[PDB]
Design a protein around this ligand. Sequence first.
Ligand SMILES: NC(=O)c1ccc[n+]([C@@H]2O[C@H](COP(=O)([O-])OP(=O)(O)OC[C@H]3O[C@@H](n4cnc5c(N)ncnc54)[C@H](O)[C@@H]3O)[C@@H](O)[C@H]2O)c1
Ligand SMILES: NC(=O)c1ccc[n+]([C@@H]2O[C@H](COP(=O)([O-])OP(=O)(O)OC[C@H]3O[C@@H](n4cnc5c(N)ncnc54)[C@H](O)[C@@H]3O)[C@@H](O)[C@H]2O)c1
Lengths: 405, 405
Amino acid sequence: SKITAAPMVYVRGEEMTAYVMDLIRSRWIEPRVDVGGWETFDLRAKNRDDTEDRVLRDVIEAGKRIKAIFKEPTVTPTADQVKRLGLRKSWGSPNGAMRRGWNGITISRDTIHIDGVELGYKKPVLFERHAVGGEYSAGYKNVGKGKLTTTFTPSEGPDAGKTVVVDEREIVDEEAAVVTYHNPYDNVHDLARFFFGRCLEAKVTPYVVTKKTVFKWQEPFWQIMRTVFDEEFKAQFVAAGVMKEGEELVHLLSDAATMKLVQWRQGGFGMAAHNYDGDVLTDELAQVHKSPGFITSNLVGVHEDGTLIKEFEASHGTVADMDEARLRGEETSLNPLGMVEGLIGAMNHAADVHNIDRDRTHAFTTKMRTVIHQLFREGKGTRDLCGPSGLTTEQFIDAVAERLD
Amino acid sequence: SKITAAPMVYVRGEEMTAYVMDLIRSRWIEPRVDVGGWETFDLRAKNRDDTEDRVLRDVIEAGKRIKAIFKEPTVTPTADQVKRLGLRKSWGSPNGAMRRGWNGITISRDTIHIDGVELGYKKPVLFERHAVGGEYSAGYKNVGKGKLTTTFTPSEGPDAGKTVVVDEREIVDEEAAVVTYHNPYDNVHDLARFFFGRCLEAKVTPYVVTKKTVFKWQEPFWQIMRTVFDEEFKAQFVAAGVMKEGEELVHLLSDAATMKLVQWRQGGFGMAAHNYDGDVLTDELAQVHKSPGFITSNLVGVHEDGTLIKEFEASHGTVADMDEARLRGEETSLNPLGMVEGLIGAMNHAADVHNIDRDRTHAFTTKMRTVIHQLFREGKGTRDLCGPSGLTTEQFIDAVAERLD
Ligand SMILES: NC(=O)c1ccc[n+]([C@@H]2O[C@H](COP(=O)([O-])OP(=O)(O)OC[C@H]3O[C@@H](n4cnc5c(N)ncnc54)[C@H](O)[C@@H]3O)[C@@H](O)[C@H]2O)c1
Ligand SMILES: NC(=O)c1ccc[n+]([C@@H]2O[C@H](COP(=O)([O-])OP(=O)(O)OC[C@H]3O[C@@H](n4cnc5c(N)ncnc54)[C@H](O)[C@@H]3O)[C@@H](O)[C@H]2O)c1
């Protein structure tokens, strides 16, 4: 009998990655797995516009109920796409909304390692991206000349109820952006614990990455991480052989960290950073390693009731350059491994949390990984790995299908 | 006779780069050059503290008068360094202050190429970093729970004098950063002209880099760039064979652009970006190429009277990690070429704008460049280029000194 898929949220996107995942669902999953328990949502920018984002609100609700989500890449539409797609409005990112809506703590993005496949980093690299805050949460306007005033009224402490000026400035340009955001730092305690725990288990040296010299408001990110490190982890790292006695936790400036990602080809390190810095640095990490096909991503959030909410995704976008080529009848070669690891993670988590066909799901998802890893080993991967002699998107999908059984 | 140095502003920093420039001034410059016309300023974090940043205000004024500045790297002190260095407060960056104070348009950061020396990028890469805006001039506070409100009152147009809410949010964290900034976009018209003109002359394909999908306030950066391109440059790029007919200006997402910097090892491209994106991406550019010793940096600003204000600098910081090694008595190997190119640029510009010993200054600055390039060609460069067999900082400085005359 087909495997019974456990309840799981499936978020569909568009462009090349939706095309790829339709093939994978059709040729790898459905002949072996009954997916009736999946809740599938259409997060095409068009459908979001048609539903006034009710579909996004529904994904967020379902994630709370089900706790295991696979998220395909989605489009955050440009002004030019607003016209081409016939959207009544620009729409923001559905990723920020989900990350916020699930009380996101960390987006973990780690390098993939396959026995016998030489990649950019020799040993595992771990990345913890702060899942919320920063410019992803910003209010803004595009304006001309005028007065911009920011105030804060605390609700606790000796100055409760009194308003202070955070900033006031005259805009003297006919064209300017004015932007306000916050960084919520309470859950950076949780992030630090999670990050240092994983680094300890993988035996990699941790680094904290910020621009706190100039972006001085970021100081608590560093201070919280250092305090958690010193009080809960420093001794464990020394005892495990990962760091030496008297070796302090190291801070890197975000610009310098881009240099460390190129330089540190041995791997064997971890970085934690704010939301946007993590976005930039994890794409860089992907390309140094090989491509975004060789990175895993997952979000850890928390339900109001305290149970974890786990979303799994590729690190990358919808691969619009290959989509253009696809629609013109030209060859493409999208590496599905990143996305597939996400779907594996989500399916395994779903089966464990909801106690449905656990053994068989784990064996099947392990099999998908194995087959993919073996094709890569045999030089029958996609072109990101193998160069021009690699297989096309469709060739690779079929090669996996033949070996699954 | 020693060469007469033209009036020029010289900004000294601290740590390793100040140590190196002290040696270079002593051993390369002063034996051949009378530096009496230089106006030198001490921007040690301690001296900024001792003078309440009067020294920084003096630099900015002198820059306006003299229009040719060499800026060594400086320390923007951390909270931790405030204590160690005995500072009354955590001073901001001198760089942001100078960039604003000189009506900064562009920070041009370009790859260095030396005949016969294999580096990361085969052909020239050009970067235009918007010199002002963004989080570099943010107002901010670190706060607890309360109400954050941002308002804007336009001074022109039909709603002049009426106040609108830009943003309002409740902070629910005990520890949060609240931040307001602006991006001034009027001078992006000038940046676009300077960028496309430079790319046209170098015959490189230009790209614009932003996060305008999610950071939607950035749209005008792209639109301004694209309009200037379409109206003033596209036809010229086609005519010069740099782009084909019907080929549009390409936009890249900032996170994706980090991948393009690793992948595009052929070089022969240009990127333009906002202030912070430029900071991050130009450090990455440096490391992919070889190190920060193989990048040039200069700031183009504009005096109230319309005259160019040109500041020259290395792309990098004070190289604190080598300074710590130096002070423990360990070997170092700082590549001075980045900084030296800045000093060259500033000396030449000074001689030209103030009409003092031009031929001889140009010959001597060319000689410094030639001697450095030749040592690199001979495998007698610093360890960033040559590996462990390369010269120490001091060996390299002495090697150049011996060949100067
Ligand atoms: N998490 C997300 O949902 C997410 C992330 C990034 C971008 N996007 C969206 O995706 C679209 C495209 O953005 P983009 O072009 O900047 O980013 P992208 O990650 O789709 O592509 C960037 C580059 O990497 C390559 N690439 C990415 N994944 C690959 C894979 N698995 N195999 C081989 N090559 C791969 C692409 O061909 C392209 O050259 C946009 O609409 C953007 O809003 C979404
Ligand atoms: N323009 C500036 O004034 C500027 C820029 C960046 C950092 N800083 C300041 O510099 C200090 C150090 O910051 P950082 O360590 O993040 O940056 P950094 O640029 O000093 O060093 C970053 C890394 O690059 C290496 N490196 C840099 N320049 C080099 C060269 N010429 N040759 C060989 N290796 C080189 C360093 O050894 C280090 O590993 C901080 O106090 C910071 O505020 C100043």
